[PDB]
Amino acid sequence: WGRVLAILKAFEEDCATPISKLRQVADAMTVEMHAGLASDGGSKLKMLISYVDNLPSGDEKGLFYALDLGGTNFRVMRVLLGGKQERVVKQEFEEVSIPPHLMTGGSDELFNFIAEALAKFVATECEDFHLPEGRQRELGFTFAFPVKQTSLSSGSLIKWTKGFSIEEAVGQDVVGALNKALERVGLDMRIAALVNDTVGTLAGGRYYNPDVVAAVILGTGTNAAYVERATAIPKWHGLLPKSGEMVINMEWGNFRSSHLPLTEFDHTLDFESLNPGEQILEKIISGMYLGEILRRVLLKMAEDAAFFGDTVPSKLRIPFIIRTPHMSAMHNDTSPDLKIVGSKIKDILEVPTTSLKMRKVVISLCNIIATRGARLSAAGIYGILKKLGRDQKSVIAMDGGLFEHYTQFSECMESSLKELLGDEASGSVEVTHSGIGAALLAASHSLYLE
């Protein structure tokens, strides 16, 4: 290593996000927010209206179910809410990994999967979760994909992201689909709310902190939601909210700008993806893609600089063979001779023996990729704050694996938001962590009292 350094040098330079560039990115973001709000097709930012005009206050009460469909995991939960003082009295939930074949199969089978798991969960209901009366179960549905919302409890799928590809479902109503799946298992359920995962995170965060104004998800995918003034949404007039507010789902994963520090590797990832040209910003930020970027750099060094000897390892040529959790562990390796980077490369790529020089390169690459994504996340948040005129206490409710379980990532993001804000503003913005959100929104729309 060995001209491996030349590629390393270039990639580091092409990925650079000095503050000037973050300011340019934030400014481009704020511009797209205005464009996206002014016209349905005016921006890469769809700026979807959620039909949430009232956020949780804390006085919600009753029994509520919630469904949560993400990119890789599905969740079923129920909660007892006891008002202002009691809040969440009791909570139960089960999590199921989604069988990969369901991601690209048919619509019915995806929704059967959801309905059948929910039915099994419902059957375990007992004690304090016993359905009172004389009543019907009420459900909140978190659905982590772009939706053209028609009401709080309805909307059609716009497109898939995160490796999903069920074309049958594009344009079809998500709640109607679930409703038909619920009919097939003979489960009676009132869907009171359908929300994007950013929206639920925002509702859940605002429930615990009145000053929450936005939510950002940095997990398998990436996205953000925020509370916008109704008058600042010229494209939409299908309701006159008394609050004067409306929560927006930005779908910022799809953001693109010439100021984005893209490399040949991000280009090849994109061109070979399931959704080429879409989710450009998501593909350099989210946990789905970070490892895959790493994989493409290492493959480049393997075939042109003999990083792994004369023969390129066969497992390096397989897409998504390197996951982001592999990256973060290697990134955390503070040890001489870098034990962890060594055992991760061996375990995952089936390469015996790596010099110190090779694992120093790998840990450097990990840092370059994680830092870019984190700093770009900060520029995103700063873009939202400028839209809000907030560039006075603002809280950003965060969720997702990258922010919760990747120390380097979440710390770099907070540092760079701080630098972006500056002495004046920084000291009035707080980034904090904690589904329940969708249930809280169902709770405001319950046909029952307590």
Ligand SMILES: OC[C@H]1O[C@@H](O)[C@H](O)[C@@H](O)[C@@H]1O
């Ligand atoms: O889960 C985080 C985000 O992932 C993106 O790929 C989806 O399009 C969004 O709807 C979601 O909010």
